[PDB]
Amino acid sequence: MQDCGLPPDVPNAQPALEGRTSFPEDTVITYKCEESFVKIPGEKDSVICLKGSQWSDIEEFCNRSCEVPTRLNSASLKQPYITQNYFPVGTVVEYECRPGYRREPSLSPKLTCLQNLKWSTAVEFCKKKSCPNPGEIRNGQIDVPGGILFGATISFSCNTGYKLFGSTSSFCLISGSSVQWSDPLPECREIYCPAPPQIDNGIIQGERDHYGYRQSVTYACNKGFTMIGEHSIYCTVNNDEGEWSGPPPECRGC
Amino acid sequence: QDCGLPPDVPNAQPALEGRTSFPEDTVITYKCEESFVKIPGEKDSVICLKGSQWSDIEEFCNRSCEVPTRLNSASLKQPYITQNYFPVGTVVEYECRPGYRREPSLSPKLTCLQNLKWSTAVEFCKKKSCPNPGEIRNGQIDVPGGILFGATISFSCNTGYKLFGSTSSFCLISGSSVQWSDPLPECREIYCPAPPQIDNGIIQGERDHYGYRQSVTYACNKGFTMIGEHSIYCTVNNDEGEWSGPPPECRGC
């Protein structure tokens, strides 16, 4: 009769019958691979009802493949693997470095789909690029806790008696073609104490315009006056603020 | 042949030894009464002569000041320093003791006043001053009470420095002047012991010396995680350098 019965049984595939058991001549039935199976590119996945109530032949067209290679932050799949989804056992794909990573020549940038439907062990075939030498801060220091490679962080400090002006840290970020420091080297500025205090009936011996950390000012009483106290005070520097070591002496008369 | 009582001399008293009769040739000496001093080059005694007659004697006592009181700033000049006769109007001269100096604007003279008292005393001989103490680098000099003769001064060394030498100085009289008993001490920078190195980590830019408040920063080698403070700093404790705490640790991953 001008009708075919059930289409052939294909291993690891299921036909779409749309709720019927009888099909008219020329009816085309498509099969869908079952779970954990991917259709093999360049293969028939459907049958057709021909004359005599006979279906056209169809061969197994499903496998048995790995999943799409896992997402790496250092490397991207090369074409054409980056657009594929069919990865039967033995399939080997190639990677290429992302930015800012570069090839580690001693290691292969290839992964293979293993018998267990898993990709081979990952190695660091694409390593992190390195930022330029941080350099130096005059009268300050740079803290490099964990190298200067892509993603690294560094901090800046200013030695005792100096005040930091600018960024207090820097990160090695990807900069277009390469990786560069997010922020420039700051400045360590000399902290000044407030002008030294003057005293009644006494003077400051050779007063300077500016006084820095540990710099001292010496007092002297006027003729006829007796000094009671410290002959000199010095600049103490704490939490980036200048402050004199103590009060100035006193000059008592007569 | 015996003389009777010797003549009455104003402001003087004779020494009779309880006697009322005296044999020829007896010599009787008089002593000036209180507040009175015998006048140099004058007779103070009488003698019993023939005819039961005493030799003549004239008043020989002039009211006089006492020997000037001792001053610690000056001393009587010669010849006043050996005199005891100071009638009203007598003016003596002083000269400075050590360690004192003359106050040009003033007079070093005292006058015996009508009331038998010396004139008002002024500071004509003033305490000498030692030279300006000067400066101690990285230290201080405390001048509690001036730098005149007899004064004391103390020395200290700022935080992070240790004093080496004298801790005080006294203004002494030194021959023809006054000088500080002790020379200035030196304030030397205290160094902490070399910072400790750590396994699988380094010191970032180690220095040769570390002083007070100076810090050393650590960094772990690739593949190691730091455990503890990233940097430590040089503390000072009774002139000794000591690190703020232990260095971090670098744990294998």
Coordinates of C-alpha atoms in Angstrom, one line a residue:
Chain A
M1 CA 0.0 0.0 0.0
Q2 CA 1.0 3.6 -0.6
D3 CA 2.3 3.6 3.0
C4 CA 5.4 2.6 5.0
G5 CA 5.3 1.2 8.5
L6 CA 7.6 2.1 11.3
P7 CA 11.0 3.4 10.2
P8 CA 14.2 1.5 10.8
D9 CA 15.8 1.3 14.3
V10 CA 19.0 3.3 14.3
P11 CA 21.4 2.7 17.2
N12 CA 21.7 5.7 19.6
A13 CA 19.1 7.7 17.6
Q14 CA 15.4 8.3 17.9
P15 CA 13.1 9.2 15.0
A16 CA 10.5 11.9 15.2
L17 CA 7.2 10.3 14.3
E18 CA 4.8 13.0 15.4
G19 CA 2.3 10.6 16.9
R20 CA 1.8 8.2 13.9
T21 CA 2.6 4.5 13.0
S22 CA 1.8 4.7 9.3
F23 CA 3.5 7.1 6.8
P24 CA 2.6 7.9 3.2
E25 CA 5.1 7.6 0.3
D26 CA 7.7 10.3 0.2
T27 CA 7.4 11.0 3.9
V28 CA 10.8 12.0 5.3
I29 CA 11.6 11.0 8.9
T30 CA 14.5 12.7 10.7
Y31 CA 16.4 11.1 13.6
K32 CA 17.9 12.8 16.6
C33 CA 21.0 11.5 18.4
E34 CA 20.4 10.3 21.9
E35 CA 21.9 11.8 25.1
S36 CA 25.7 11.7 25.2
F37 CA 25.6 11.3 21.4
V38 CA 26.5 13.9 18.7
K39 CA 25.7 13.4 15.0
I40 CA 28.6 12.8 12.7
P41 CA 29.1 15.6 10.2
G42 CA 28.5 14.7 6.6
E43 CA 26.2 11.9 7.4
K44 CA 22.5 11.2 6.7
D45 CA 20.1 11.7 9.7
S46 CA 16.8 10.9 7.9
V47 CA 15.0 8.3 5.9
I48 CA 12.3 8.5 3.2
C49 CA 9.4 6.3 2.4
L50 CA 9.8 4.9 -1.1
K51 CA 7.8 2.7 -3.5
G52 CA 6.7 -0.8 -2.3
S53 CA 6.3 0.4 1.3
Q54 CA 10.1 0.4 1.8
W55 CA 12.2 2.9 3.7
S56 CA 15.5 4.2 2.4
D57 CA 18.6 2.9 4.1
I58 CA 20.3 4.7 7.0
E59 CA 23.5 4.0 8.9
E60 CA 24.4 4.8 12.5
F61 CA 25.4 8.5 12.4
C62 CA 25.9 9.2 16.1
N63 CA 28.9 9.1 18.6
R64 CA 30.4 9.4 21.4
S65 CA 32.3 12.7 21.8
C66 CA 33.9 14.9 24.4
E67 CA 32.2 18.1 25.6
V68 CA 33.3 21.4 24.2
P69 CA 36.8 22.1 25.6
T70 CA 36.6 24.0 29.0
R71 CA 37.0 27.7 29.0
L72 CA 40.6 28.8 29.8
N73 CA 41.5 32.3 30.9
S74 CA 45.0 32.0 29.3
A75 CA 44.1 30.5 26.0
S76 CA 41.4 30.5 23.3
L77 CA 40.6 27.6 20.9
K78 CA 42.1 28.2 17.5
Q79 CA 39.9 28.0 14.4
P80 CA 38.3 25.9 13.5
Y81 CA 37.9 24.1 16.8
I82 CA 36.5 27.2 18.4
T83 CA 33.3 26.6 16.3
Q84 CA 33.0 22.9 16.6
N85 CA 31.0 20.6 18.9
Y86 CA 31.8 17.2 17.5
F87 CA 34.8 15.7 19.3
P88 CA 35.0 11.9 19.1
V89 CA 37.7 10.1 21.1
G90 CA 41.2 10.9 19.7
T91 CA 40.2 14.4 18.6
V92 CA 43.0 16.9 19.3
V93 CA 42.4 20.6 19.3
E94 CA 44.8 23.6 19.3
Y95 CA 44.8 26.7 21.5
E96 CA 46.4 30.1 21.1
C97 CA 47.3 32.6 23.8
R98 CA 44.9 35.2 25.0
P99 CA 46.2 38.6 26.1
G100 CA 48.1 39.2 28.1
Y101 CA 49.5 35.6 28.0
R102 CA 52.2 34.3 25.9
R103 CA 53.3 30.8 24.7
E104 CA 55.5 28.7 26.9
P105 CA 57.4 27.0 24.1
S106 CA 58.4 23.9 26.1
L107 CA 54.7 23.0 26.4
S108 CA 52.1 21.9 23.9
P109 CA 49.0 24.0 23.3
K110 CA 47.0 21.0 22.4
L111 CA 44.3 19.0 24.2
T112 CA 43.1 15.5 23.2
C113 CA 39.7 13.9 23.8
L114 CA 40.4 10.8 25.8
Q115 CA 38.6 7.4 25.8
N116 CA 36.7 8.4 28.9
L117 CA 35.2 11.4 27.0
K118 CA 37.4 13.8 28.8
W119 CA 40.0 16.3 27.6
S120 CA 43.7 15.6 28.4
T121 CA 45.4 17.2 31.4
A122 CA 45.9 21.0 31.1
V123 CA 49.3 22.5 31.3
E124 CA 50.5 26.1 31.3
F125 CA 51.3 26.3 27.6
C126 CA 50.1 29.9 27.7
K127 CA 51.8 31.8 30.5
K128 CA 51.1 35.3 32.1
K129 CA 52.9 38.2 30.5
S130 CA 55.1 40.4 32.7
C131 CA 54.8 44.1 33.4
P132 CA 57.8 46.5 33.2
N133 CA 60.2 46.8 36.1
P134 CA 58.3 49.0 38.7
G135 CA 61.5 51.0 39.2
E136 CA 62.1 53.1 42.3
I137 CA 60.6 55.8 44.4
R138 CA 63.1 58.3 45.8
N139 CA 62.7 58.4 49.6
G140 CA 60.1 55.7 49.4
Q141 CA 59.6 52.0 48.7
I142 CA 57.7 49.6 46.5
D143 CA 56.2 46.4 47.9
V144 CA 56.1 43.6 45.4
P145 CA 54.4 40.7 47.4
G146 CA 53.8 38.4 44.5
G147 CA 55.9 39.2 41.4
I148 CA 55.1 41.6 38.5
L149 CA 53.2 39.3 36.1
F150 CA 49.8 40.0 34.6
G151 CA 47.3 40.4 37.4
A152 CA 49.9 41.3 40.1
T153 CA 49.5 44.1 42.6
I154 CA 52.2 46.3 44.2
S155 CA 52.0 48.9 46.9
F156 CA 53.9 52.1 47.6
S157 CA 55.2 53.7 50.8
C158 CA 57.1 56.8 51.8
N159 CA 60.0 56.6 54.3
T160 CA 59.8 58.3 57.7
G161 CA 59.8 62.1 57.2
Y162 CA 58.2 62.0 53.8
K163 CA 54.6 62.1 52.6
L164 CA 53.3 60.0 49.7
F165 CA 51.6 62.0 46.9
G166 CA 49.9 60.0 44.1
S167 CA 48.8 56.4 43.9
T168 CA 49.3 54.1 46.9
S169 CA 49.2 50.9 44.7
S170 CA 49.4 49.6 41.2
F171 CA 48.0 46.6 39.2
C172 CA 49.5 45.0 36.1
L173 CA 46.5 45.1 33.8
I174 CA 46.2 44.1 30.1
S175 CA 46.9 47.2 28.0
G176 CA 45.8 46.6 24.4
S177 CA 48.6 44.5 22.9
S178 CA 50.4 44.0 26.2
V179 CA 50.1 44.5 29.9
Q180 CA 51.1 47.6 31.8
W181 CA 51.0 49.3 35.2
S182 CA 47.6 50.8 35.9
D183 CA 49.1 53.8 37.9
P184 CA 52.4 55.7 37.7
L185 CA 55.0 55.9 40.4
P186 CA 53.9 58.3 43.1
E187 CA 55.9 60.9 45.0
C188 CA 57.4 60.8 48.5
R189 CA 57.4 64.4 49.8
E190 CA 59.4 65.8 52.7
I191 CA 57.2 66.6 55.7
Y192 CA 57.8 69.9 57.4
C193 CA 57.3 70.9 61.0
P194 CA 55.3 74.0 61.7
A195 CA 57.5 77.1 62.2
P196 CA 59.4 76.8 65.5
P197 CA 58.0 78.9 68.3
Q198 CA 59.6 82.1 69.4
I199 CA 60.3 82.9 73.0
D200 CA 60.2 86.0 75.2
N201 CA 63.6 87.5 75.8
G202 CA 65.4 84.9 73.7
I203 CA 66.0 84.0 70.1
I204 CA 66.4 81.1 67.7
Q205 CA 70.0 80.7 66.7
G206 CA 70.1 80.9 62.9
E207 CA 66.4 80.1 62.1
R208 CA 65.9 78.2 58.9
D209 CA 62.9 78.6 56.5
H210 CA 61.9 74.9 56.7
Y211 CA 62.5 72.2 59.3
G212 CA 62.3 68.5 58.4
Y213 CA 62.3 65.3 60.3
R214 CA 64.9 65.2 63.1
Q215 CA 66.1 68.7 62.2
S216 CA 66.6 70.8 65.3
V217 CA 66.3 74.4 66.4
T218 CA 68.6 75.9 69.1
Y219 CA 67.5 78.6 71.5
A220 CA 69.5 81.3 73.3
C221 CA 68.5 83.7 76.0
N222 CA 69.1 87.4 75.8
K223 CA 71.8 89.0 78.0
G224 CA 70.5 89.2 81.6
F225 CA 68.2 86.2 81.2
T226 CA 68.6 82.6 82.4
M227 CA 67.6 79.7 80.3
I228 CA 65.3 77.2 82.0
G229 CA 64.6 74.2 79.8
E230 CA 66.0 72.4 76.8
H231 CA 68.6 74.3 74.8
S232 CA 67.0 72.9 71.6
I233 CA 64.0 71.0 70.2
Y234 CA 63.8 68.8 67.1
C235 CA 61.2 67.9 64.6
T236 CA 59.3 64.7 65.3
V237 CA 57.4 63.2 62.4
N238 CA 54.4 61.0 63.1
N239 CA 51.5 59.8 60.9
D240 CA 52.7 62.2 58.1
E241 CA 52.5 65.2 60.4
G242 CA 55.4 67.2 61.7
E243 CA 55.5 68.1 65.4
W244 CA 58.2 69.6 67.6
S245 CA 59.8 67.2 70.2
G246 CA 58.6 69.5 73.1
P247 CA 58.1 73.1 74.2
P248 CA 60.8 75.8 73.8
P249 CA 62.8 76.8 76.9
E250 CA 62.0 79.8 78.9
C251 CA 64.1 82.9 79.6
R252 CA 63.7 84.3 83.1
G253 CA 65.1 87.6 84.4
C254 CA 66.2 89.6 86.6
Chain B
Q1 CA 105.5 106.0 146.9
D2 CA 102.6 104.0 145.6
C3 CA 100.3 105.6 143.0
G4 CA 96.6 105.5 143.5
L5 CA 94.0 104.8 140.8
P6 CA 95.1 105.5 137.3
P7 CA 93.5 108.3 135.3
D8 CA 90.1 108.0 133.8
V9 CA 90.3 107.6 130.0
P10 CA 87.1 108.1 128.0
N11 CA 85.9 104.9 126.3
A12 CA 88.7 102.8 127.8
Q13 CA 89.0 100.6 130.8
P14 CA 92.3 99.9 132.7
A15 CA 93.3 96.5 133.8
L16 CA 94.0 96.8 137.5
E17 CA 93.9 93.1 138.7
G18 CA 91.7 94.1 141.6
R19 CA 94.3 96.6 142.9
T20 CA 93.8 100.0 144.2
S21 CA 97.4 100.9 145.0
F22 CA 100.3 100.5 142.6
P23 CA 104.1 100.6 143.2
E24 CA 106.4 102.9 141.3
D25 CA 107.1 101.8 137.7
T26 CA 103.9 99.9 137.5
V27 CA 102.5 99.9 134.0
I28 CA 98.8 99.9 133.4
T29 CA 97.3 99.1 130.1
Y30 CA 93.8 100.3 128.9
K31 CA 91.4 98.4 126.6
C32 CA 89.0 100.2 124.4
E33 CA 85.3 99.7 125.3
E34 CA 82.7 98.0 123.1
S35 CA 82.3 99.5 119.6
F36 CA 85.7 101.3 120.1
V37 CA 89.0 100.5 118.5
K38 CA 92.4 101.8 119.6
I39 CA 94.0 104.4 117.3
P40 CA 97.2 103.1 115.7
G41 CA 100.3 104.9 116.8
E42 CA 98.8 105.9 120.2
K43 CA 99.6 105.2 123.8
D44 CA 97.3 102.8 125.6
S45 CA 99.1 102.5 128.9
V46 CA 100.3 104.6 131.8
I47 CA 103.2 104.3 134.2
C48 CA 103.5 105.1 137.9
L49 CA 106.3 107.6 138.4
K50 CA 108.0 109.4 141.3
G51 CA 105.9 111.6 143.4
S52 CA 103.0 109.1 143.2
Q53 CA 102.1 110.6 139.8
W54 CA 100.9 108.7 136.7
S55 CA 102.2 109.5 133.3
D56 CA 99.8 111.3 130.9
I57 CA 97.5 109.5 128.5
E58 CA 95.1 110.8 125.9
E59 CA 91.9 109.3 124.5
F60 CA 93.1 106.6 122.1
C61 CA 89.8 105.0 121.1
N62 CA 87.8 105.8 118.0
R63 CA 84.5 104.3 117.5
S64 CA 85.0 101.8 114.6
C65 CA 83.2 99.4 112.4
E66 CA 83.7 95.7 112.7
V67 CA 85.9 93.7 110.3
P68 CA 83.7 93.6 107.2
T69 CA 81.6 90.4 106.9
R70 CA 82.8 87.6 104.7
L71 CA 81.5 87.6 101.1
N72 CA 81.6 84.6 98.9
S73 CA 81.9 86.7 95.7
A74 CA 84.8 88.9 96.7
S75 CA 87.6 89.3 99.2
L76 CA 89.1 92.4 100.9
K77 CA 92.1 93.7 99.1
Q78 CA 95.4 94.5 100.8
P79 CA 95.9 96.1 103.1
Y80 CA 92.3 96.2 104.4
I81 CA 92.3 92.4 104.7
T82 CA 94.7 92.7 107.6
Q83 CA 93.2 95.7 109.4
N84 CA 90.8 96.0 112.3
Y85 CA 90.7 99.8 112.8
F86 CA 87.8 101.2 110.8
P87 CA 86.7 104.7 112.0
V88 CA 83.6 106.3 110.4
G89 CA 84.3 107.3 106.8
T90 CA 86.8 104.4 106.2
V91 CA 86.4 102.9 102.8
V92 CA 87.8 99.5 101.9
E93 CA 88.2 97.8 98.5
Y94 CA 87.3 94.3 97.5
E95 CA 88.6 92.1 94.7
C96 CA 86.8 89.1 93.1
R97 CA 87.1 85.6 94.4
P98 CA 87.0 82.7 91.9
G99 CA 84.9 82.0 90.1
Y100 CA 83.5 85.5 90.0
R101 CA 83.9 88.5 87.7
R102 CA 83.6 92.3 88.2
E103 CA 80.4 94.1 87.3
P104 CA 82.0 97.2 85.8
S105 CA 79.0 99.5 86.4
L106 CA 79.4 98.9 90.2
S107 CA 81.9 99.8 92.9
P108 CA 83.8 97.2 94.8
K109 CA 84.1 99.5 97.8
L110 CA 82.4 99.6 101.2
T111 CA 82.3 102.5 103.6
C112 CA 82.0 102.6 107.3
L113 CA 78.9 104.6 108.1
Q114 CA 78.2 106.9 111.1
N115 CA 76.2 104.1 112.7
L116 CA 79.3 102.0 112.7
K117 CA 77.9 99.8 109.9
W118 CA 79.3 99.1 106.4
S119 CA 77.5 100.5 103.4
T120 CA 74.9 98.5 101.5
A121 CA 76.4 95.6 99.6
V122 CA 76.0 95.3 95.8
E123 CA 76.9 92.6 93.3
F124 CA 80.2 94.2 92.2
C125 CA 81.7 90.7 91.8
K126 CA 79.3 88.5 89.8
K127 CA 79.4 84.8 89.1
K128 CA 81.3 83.9 85.9
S129 CA 79.5 82.1 83.2
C130 CA 80.9 78.9 81.6
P131 CA 81.1 78.9 77.8
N132 CA 78.0 78.2 75.8
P133 CA 77.4 74.4 76.1
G134 CA 77.0 74.1 72.4
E135 CA 75.2 71.3 70.6
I136 CA 75.0 67.5 70.6
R137 CA 74.1 66.1 67.2
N138 CA 71.0 63.9 67.6
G139 CA 70.7 64.7 71.3
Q140 CA 69.9 67.6 73.6
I141 CA 71.3 69.6 76.5
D142 CA 69.0 70.5 79.3
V143 CA 69.9 73.8 81.0
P144 CA 67.7 73.9 84.1
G145 CA 69.3 77.0 85.8
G146 CA 71.7 78.9 83.5
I147 CA 75.4 78.4 82.8
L148 CA 77.0 80.4 85.6
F149 CA 79.6 79.2 88.0
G150 CA 78.1 76.3 90.0
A151 CA 75.5 75.4 87.4
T152 CA 74.7 71.9 86.3
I153 CA 73.5 70.7 82.8
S154 CA 72.4 67.3 81.6
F155 CA 72.6 65.4 78.3
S156 CA 70.2 63.2 76.5
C157 CA 70.1 61.3 73.2
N158 CA 67.0 61.4 70.9
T159 CA 65.0 58.3 70.2
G160 CA 67.0 55.8 68.2
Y161 CA 70.4 57.1 69.5
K162 CA 72.5 56.0 72.4
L163 CA 74.5 58.4 74.6
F164 CA 78.2 57.8 74.9
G165 CA 80.2 59.9 77.3
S166 CA 79.2 62.1 80.2
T167 CA 75.5 62.4 81.1
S168 CA 75.9 65.7 82.9
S169 CA 78.3 68.6 83.3
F170 CA 79.0 71.1 86.2
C171 CA 80.4 74.6 85.9
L172 CA 83.7 74.3 87.9
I173 CA 86.3 76.9 88.7
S174 CA 89.3 76.0 86.6
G175 CA 92.4 77.9 87.7
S176 CA 91.9 81.4 86.3
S177 CA 88.3 80.7 85.3
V178 CA 85.3 78.4 85.1
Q179 CA 84.9 75.4 82.9
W180 CA 82.5 72.6 82.3
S181 CA 83.4 69.5 84.4
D182 CA 82.6 67.2 81.5
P183 CA 82.9 67.4 77.7
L184 CA 79.9 66.8 75.4
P185 CA 78.8 63.2 74.9
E186 CA 78.2 61.8 71.4
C187 CA 74.7 60.7 70.2
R188 CA 75.3 57.6 68.0
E189 CA 72.7 56.0 65.8
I190 CA 71.5 52.6 67.2
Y191 CA 71.3 49.8 64.7
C192 CA 69.0 46.8 64.8
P193 CA 70.6 43.4 64.3
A194 CA 70.6 42.1 60.7
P195 CA 67.0 41.3 59.7
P196 CA 66.2 37.6 59.7
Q197 CA 66.0 35.8 56.3
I198 CA 63.1 33.4 55.7
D199 CA 62.7 30.0 53.9
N200 CA 61.4 30.3 50.3
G201 CA 61.2 34.1 50.5
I202 CA 63.5 37.1 50.3
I203 CA 64.0 40.6 51.8
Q204 CA 63.1 43.2 49.2
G205 CA 66.3 45.4 48.7
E206 CA 68.0 44.6 52.0
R207 CA 70.1 47.4 53.4
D208 CA 73.4 47.2 55.2
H209 CA 72.1 49.0 58.2
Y210 CA 68.7 49.5 59.8
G211 CA 68.0 52.3 62.3
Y212 CA 65.1 53.2 64.4
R213 CA 61.8 53.1 62.6
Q214 CA 63.4 51.7 59.5
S215 CA 61.5 48.8 58.0
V216 CA 62.3 45.6 56.0
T217 CA 59.8 44.2 53.5
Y218 CA 59.5 40.5 52.8
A219 CA 58.3 38.7 49.6
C220 CA 57.6 35.0 49.1
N221 CA 59.0 33.1 46.2
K222 CA 56.7 32.1 43.3
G223 CA 54.5 29.2 44.4
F224 CA 54.5 30.2 48.1
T225 CA 51.9 32.0 50.3
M226 CA 53.0 34.5 52.9
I227 CA 52.0 33.9 56.5
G228 CA 52.5 36.7 59.0
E229 CA 53.4 40.4 58.7
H230 CA 54.7 41.5 55.3
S231 CA 57.3 43.9 56.8
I232 CA 58.9 44.5 60.2
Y233 CA 60.5 47.6 61.6
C234 CA 63.5 48.5 63.8
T235 CA 62.4 49.4 67.3
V236 CA 64.6 50.7 70.1
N237 CA 64.5 49.6 73.7
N238 CA 66.9 51.0 76.2
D239 CA 69.6 51.8 73.7
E240 CA 69.2 48.5 72.0
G241 CA 67.8 47.8 68.5
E242 CA 65.1 45.1 68.2
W243 CA 62.7 44.1 65.4
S244 CA 59.0 44.8 65.9
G245 CA 58.1 41.2 65.5
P246 CA 58.9 37.9 63.7
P247 CA 59.3 37.7 59.9
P248 CA 56.4 36.3 57.9
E249 CA 56.4 32.7 56.7
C250 CA 56.2 31.3 53.2
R251 CA 54.0 28.3 52.8
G252 CA 54.4 25.8 49.9
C253 CA 51.4 25.5 47.6

